Ligand binder design. Structure first.
Ligand SMILES: [Zn+2]
Lengths: 197, 8, 107, 63, 64, 49, 309, 149, 49, 185, 96
């Protein structure tokens, strides 16, 4: 939800979330610039994770690059029917690819594929580059960030509005259940090799 | 959601 | 018996200091975080509770342009006294306008 | 379920009798809960449950 | 057993609303108006009095 | 490729050969139990159905 | 921009809506959530009151248990002014005149001798069979009879059913009211619930007439949207959008979800403080504003103690 | 001047790939003076753009048109005459990918530079004669203003 | 024990090498239960029940 | 537990001012996770939530007998209208605010009245304890003042770590270490 | 009704939190065929697969094809079939 493209934080929300992700960081918190500078200083959900990474990677060590692929595909963000523009591969600009550059997220959504138990992700690359304690701090700080985004700004729930079926596609279901009562004899004659007579 | 008696 | 610990960052760096306020929660820690962030001399001000089993908060204040970070924190507190005092003075003098309209309406 | 077992605690001498102070009858119940009149011995309390992932301690079969 | 003094969710004193609740129900009010006309507005308080089985009249039968 | 390319083929090979050498199992590893648990902890997970 | 104190003292205003006894509703234009939430969370947990802490029983012969009776007496609001009394320094079992209050719930149940023919009604058979809180006798100690008149120190509601008795059964205990804040235990809170809500706005982006205005008239709460006749047609206009429950019902109808812009008005909170009766509600909001100032003054005293300079 | 790009575009299509994010919209633009093209993600909640509209577009590497030092730090307490005050919509993001249509030929006819403004992506493909300033990991600004005639 | 000391943690049955790890202590007031993070109870094969 | 077979251990008693109060002034009473639902598929808990809310708002008592609602008259479209008449939302959601910050949560939370139950399942520190007279290591033995067994598989796993001295500690230095006298001849 | 990402259940499914696209297809579409020990649920000794049904009835509902979701409930034949399939896995876990 946070590292999706649509999030936009103002300055005080960003500086609360970054310090919720941290706790007794010994040094100055090395903040970022706004992603949108005018009309309003709007940060992004990706820059909060990026600020957190640049602050938890140690002081002398330069941040890491990464690329790859996430768990949500490209067929999951589609809502309309896609039109094929002539000279554009949609995976060039897609949210499938987590394209962290210099420790900063520049594309992609973080999933189980990058900070879960799933291999070859962000917290595994931070294990096979920086070591153990930094890769423990990445899990700890990304836990504290991702909870204190749900306490404070956007709480997460499970209604009944999110399991329902639209009434136009619910008629297209009661007409296939009605066809499914006539499936009987035609599957037995093909099971016993009997003719139609 | 009664209206206020001390008006603006 | 103490109630406030100042923890310097690197000993010499008095621009970043994490005020550890004892016997607190998000009541004063979030009202102060609103007031210190209303200072243009503050680059970053965030707080966190330590653990809910404890009752103290951290409060990072870090400044730009070479101010020690207790001066946005004294201004952080006095400019909340001056806000609660004004809320109190406009509340106690708006209750009285309500009581003296309940009295002199049909009585 | 720790519920309200019985009415006569003074002349029954079991080893353990788990009693719940102030149980409540359920608001949403089937007709068999009243065909047998289970309100003589109710087992739980109603609760205003909100389904939210608000705290951080609220995960993997905890509340 | 006996009506709780305070409502569980938000602590409105609801312990003084039980005998006057039975009195409204014997006077042919409905339970949607015997919880309205006692001043119970939020459904966390109306939960506390509607769903309450007063289990101490049955329990006092076993009296010395 | 219009990126940096700060390293050449020889430094790339030296990086990979160094990480092959540094990923040798260090002496004292007790690999016998690690081979006796790798075929013993999913021995509990082999459900018959 | 920064904190212009004269932008605050120009745009802030409190508008009291209703205040009878044990209730209050007021607005607050121009305060932000980090101060209004501090007021709300100081009402619920910081404004101190008085409540029962120790219970010294002799002969609880009743059906209500010895533990459950003490817990049930703890939740009874005492009508003592909290500001008169002090905290108990830890470890004193018998507090002084200033620390503690006392009571005594001494009820014995007996059968009714006369007018007990062919009846099974409990009011006609038994005397003292429902132990109410009007059976509590205030027992002043030291010189507390002089500080408070006859009838000030008292339980608030005097109808709360404590126990229920049958003949032969007795309750002879003795209480000790103490002082505490509403977060040490919930029995010390002064408020039923204290909350707020932003004032909603509803903006008809399209003029709706006819039966679509009646279809709009029933999606919101009763009293928000009014349907008026203007020369044969029935056009809808909003009227007091404070009444709205903000239930998002208009975003279920399809043709009419794109004509109103149901949102909230920023920094226009509508409080409501309902006291339990220990203090009047406009004195509880005053002594909740005055606690946040004390929390500021204690840390300013600590900063004066750290740096002498 | 620190200008790396300047052209006046024209929106011709909005969200053809179907991925409709909330508060972010794709803008398949084309140039008019040149023959370049553009994919842009703007914030609709803050600065709305509909199709058919025409807008000025400037991609700088610094806001300080005099005394070019591009320090790369935001201070809201600094009021200095900069380049942002002329335009309405100002972003700030890295260039992360430069991949053209080359066939063993350096700086071919088509060159595509990919900018990622903290998550909001941007393709700027055209003649490689214009895109000389863009290198990988180059903190560029996006400056934009809509003009109606 | 203080807020930096090591306790060695053990949930039986232990079938593999990360089933006994050494966690740094932290002293939390007025509790009864041990408390773990969520990353570790995939190693210990715990269920918080 | 509720009545739909979804146990939850009590993890943390969260103070009331921190609870997300609703738009009606109510704090919740028990916070339940959305992450017990997609693997366990208790739709009956959601309909019980909507139905307990719509019954406490009306004084009614609602029939939840199995097989009384068909697909043409749904269980979510019945109590949905019962909540639509009561003023609240047709899908059981109410606009919770926050209590740790002060402002409104952006996704409206499913809240309702669910009948919880309390199970009978109720809820060991050793130093210089009493040893037994044979094999003087700490006693154990299904009672009080008993030590904690290390174990065969812990021997196994801790040799697999490579830490020979923590095994030396927990297996020789902390239980029955003795001095013995031998003639070297 | 409400789709990914605005759908919460699709966000727990597709971002790998819990569940899968089989549990949500059982919630909002059919339960599908009941496979009991690899096959359809057993006929009786009289050819009635369950006492609601005619002996050797051709309809797919007679042999366990549930075609009713959990969002709108399952009729008592399909509830019995689904409890057979539940007790199968529970017994096979409890024994082995
Ligand atoms: Zn209540």
């Amino acid at each position: 939800s946070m590292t999706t493209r649509g999030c936009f934080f103002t300055r005080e929300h960003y500086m609360e979330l970054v310090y919720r992700g941290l706790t007794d960081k010994v040094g100055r918190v090395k903040l970022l610039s706004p992603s949108i500078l005018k009309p309003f200083p709007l940060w992004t959900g990706k820059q909060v994770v990026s600020t957190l990474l640049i602050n938890i990677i140690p002081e002398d060590h330069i941040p890491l690059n990464l690329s790859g692929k996430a768990k949500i595909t490209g067929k999951a963000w589609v809502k309309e029917t896609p039109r094929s523009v002539p000279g554009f591969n949609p995976d060039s600009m897609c949210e499938s690819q987590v394209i962290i550059r210099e420790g900063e997220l520049l594309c992609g959504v973080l999933d189980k594929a990058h900070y879960g138990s799933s291999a070859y992700g962000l917290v595994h690359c931070c294990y096979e580059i920086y070591g153990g304690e930094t890769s423990g701090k990445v899990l700890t700080c990304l836990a504290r960030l991702f909870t204190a985004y749900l306490q404070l700004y956007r709480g997460f729930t499970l209604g009944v509005e999110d399991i329902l079926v639209k009434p136009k596609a619910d008629v297209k279901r009661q007409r296939i259940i009605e066809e499914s009562t006539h499936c009987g004899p035609q599957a037995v004659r093909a099971a016993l090799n009997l003719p139609e007579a | 959601g009664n209206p206020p008696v001390t008006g603006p | 018996k103490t109630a406030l610990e100042m923890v310097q960052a690197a000993g010499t760096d008095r621009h970043c200091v994490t005020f550890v306020l004892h016997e607190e929660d998000h009541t004063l820690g979030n009202s102060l975080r609103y007031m210190i962030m209303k200072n243009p001399e503050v680059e970053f001000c965030g707080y966190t509770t330590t653990h809910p089993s404890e009752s103290k908060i951290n409060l990072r204040i870090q400044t730009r342009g070479t101010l020690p970070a207790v001066e946005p924190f004294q201004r952080g507190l006095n400019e909340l006294m001056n806000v609660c005092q004004h809320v109190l003075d406009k509340f106690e003098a708006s209750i009285k306008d309500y009581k003296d309209q309940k009295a002199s309406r049909n009585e | 379920t720790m519920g309200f077992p019985l009415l006569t605690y003074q002349d029954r001498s079991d080893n353990k009798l788990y009693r719940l102070q102030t149980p409540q009858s359920p608001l949403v119940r089937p007709s068999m809960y009243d065909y047998y009149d289970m309100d003589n011995y109710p087992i739980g309390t109603n609760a205003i449950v909100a389904v939210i992932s608000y705290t951080g301690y609220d995960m993997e079969d905890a509340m | 057993m006996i009506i709780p003094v305070r409502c569980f969710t938000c602590g409105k004193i609801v312990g003084n609303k039980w005998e006057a609740y039975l009195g409204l129900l014997q006077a042919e009010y409905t339970e949607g108006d015997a919880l309205d006309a006692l001043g119970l507005k939020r459904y966390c308080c109306r939960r506390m009095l509607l769903a309450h089985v007063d289990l101490i009249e049955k329990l006092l039968n076993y009296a010395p | 490729s219009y990126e940096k390319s700060e390293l050449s083929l020889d430094r790339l090979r030296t990086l990979l050969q160094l990480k092959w050498q540094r990923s040798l199992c260090e002496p004292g590893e007790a690999v016998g139990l690690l081979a006796a648990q790798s075929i013993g902890e999913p021995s509990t997970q082999m459900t018959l159905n | 921009d920064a904190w212009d104190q004269d932008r605050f003292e120009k745009n802030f205003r409190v508008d009291v809506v209703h205040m009878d006894e044990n209730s209050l509703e007021f607005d607050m234009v121009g305060i932000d959530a980090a101060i209004a939430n501090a007021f709300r969370r100081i009402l619920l947990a910081e404004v101190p009151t008085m409540a029962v802490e120790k219970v010294l029983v002799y002969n609880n012969t009743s059906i209500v248990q010895d533990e459950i009776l003490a817990h049930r007496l703890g939740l009874i609001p005492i009508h003592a002014d909290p500001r008169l009394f002090e905290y108990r320094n830890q470890g004193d079992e018998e507090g002084t005149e200033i620390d503690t209050l006392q009571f005594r719930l001494q009820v014995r149940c007996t059968r009714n001798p006369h007018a007990a023919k062919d009846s099974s009604d409990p009011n006609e058979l038994y005397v003292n069979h429902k132990v109410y809180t009007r059976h509590m006798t205030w027992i002043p100690l030291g010189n507390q009879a002089d500080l408070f008149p006859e009838g000030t120190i008292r339980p608030v509601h005097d109808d709360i059913l404590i126990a229920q008795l049958r003949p032969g059964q007795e309750i002879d205990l003795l209480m000790h009211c103490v002082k505490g804040i509403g977060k040490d235990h919930a029995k010390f809170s002064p408020v039923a619930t204290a909350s707020y809500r932003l004032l909603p706005d509803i903006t008809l982006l399209e003029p709706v007439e006819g039966e679509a205005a009646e279809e709009l008239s029933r999606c919101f709460s009763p009293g928000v949207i009014e349907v008026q006749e203007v020369q044969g047609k029935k056009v809808a206009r909003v009227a007091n959008p404070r009444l709205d429950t903000f239930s998002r019902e208009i975003f279920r109808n399809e043709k009419l979800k794109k004509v109103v812009r149901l949102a909230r008005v920023r920094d226009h909170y509508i409080f409501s403080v309902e006291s339990t009766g220990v203090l009047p509600p406009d004195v509880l909001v005053s002594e909740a504003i005055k606690v946040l100032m004390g929390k500021c003054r204690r840390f300013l005293d600590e900063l004066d103690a750290v740096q002498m300079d | 001047a620190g200008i790396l790009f300047e052209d006046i575009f024209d929106v011709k299509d909005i969200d053809p790939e179907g991925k409709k994010f909330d508060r972010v919209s794709r803008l398949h633009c084309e140039s008019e003076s040149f023959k370049m093209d553009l994919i842009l993600d703007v914030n609709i909640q803050i600065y709305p753009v509909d199709l058919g509209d025409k807008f000025r577009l400037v991609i700088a590497s610094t806001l300080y048109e005099d005394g070019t030092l591009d320090d790369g730090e935001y201070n809201p307490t600094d009021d200095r005459p900069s380049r942002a005050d002329q335009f309405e919509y100002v972003m700030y993001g890295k260039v992360y990918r430069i991949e053209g249509d080359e066939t063993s030929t350096e700086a071919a006819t088509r060159l595509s530079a990919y900018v990622s403004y903290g998550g909001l992506l941007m393709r700027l493909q055209g003649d490689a004669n214009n895109l000389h300033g863009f290198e990988v990991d180059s903190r560029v600004y996006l400056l934009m203003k809509k003009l109606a005639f | 024990v203080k807020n930096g000391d090591i306790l060695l943690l053990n949930r039986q049955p232990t079938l593999h090498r990360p089933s006994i790890q050494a966690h740094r202590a932290r002293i939390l007031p007025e509790e009864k239960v041990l408390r773990l993070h969520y990353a570790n109870c995939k190693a210990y094969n715990a269920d918080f029940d | 537990a509720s009545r739909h077979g979804q146990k939850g251990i009590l993890s943390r008693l969260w103070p009331a001012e921190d609870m997300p109060f609703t738009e009606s002034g109510m704090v919740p009473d028990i916070l339940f996770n959305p992450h017990g639902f997609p693997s366990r598929m208790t739709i009956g808990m959601l309909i019980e939530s909507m139905a307990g809310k719509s019954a406490a708002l009306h004084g009614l008592c609602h029939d939840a007998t199995p097989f009384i609602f068909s697909e043409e008259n749904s269980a979510l479209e019945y109590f949905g209208e019962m909540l639509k008449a009561a003023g609240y939302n047709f899908y059981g959601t109410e606009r919770l605010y926050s209590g740790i910050s002060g402002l409104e949560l952006e996704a409206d939370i499913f809240i309702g009245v669910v009948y919880y139950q309390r199970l009978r399942h109720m809820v060991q520190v050793r130093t210089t304890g009493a040893r037994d007279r044979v094999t003087n290591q700490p006693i154990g033995g299904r009672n009080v003042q008993g030590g904690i067994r290390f174990g065969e598989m812990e021997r196994d796993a801790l040799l697999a770590h490579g830490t020979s001295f923590l095994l030396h500690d927990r297996l020789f230095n902390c239980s029955d270490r003795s001095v013995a006298h031998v003639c070297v001849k | 009704h409400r789709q990914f990402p605005e759908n919460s259940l699709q966000m727990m499914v597709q971002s790998g939190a819990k569940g899968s696209t089989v549990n949500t297809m059982q919630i909002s579409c059919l339960l599908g065929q009941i496979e009991l020990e690899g096959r359809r649920p057993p006929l009786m000794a009289s050819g009635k697969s369950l006492p609601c049904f005619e002996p050797y009835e051709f309809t797919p509902r007679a042999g366990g094809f549930v075609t009713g979701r959990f969002l709108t409930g399952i009729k008592p034949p399909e509830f019995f079939f689904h409890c057979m399939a539940g007790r199968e896995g529970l017994v096979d876990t409890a024994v082995k």
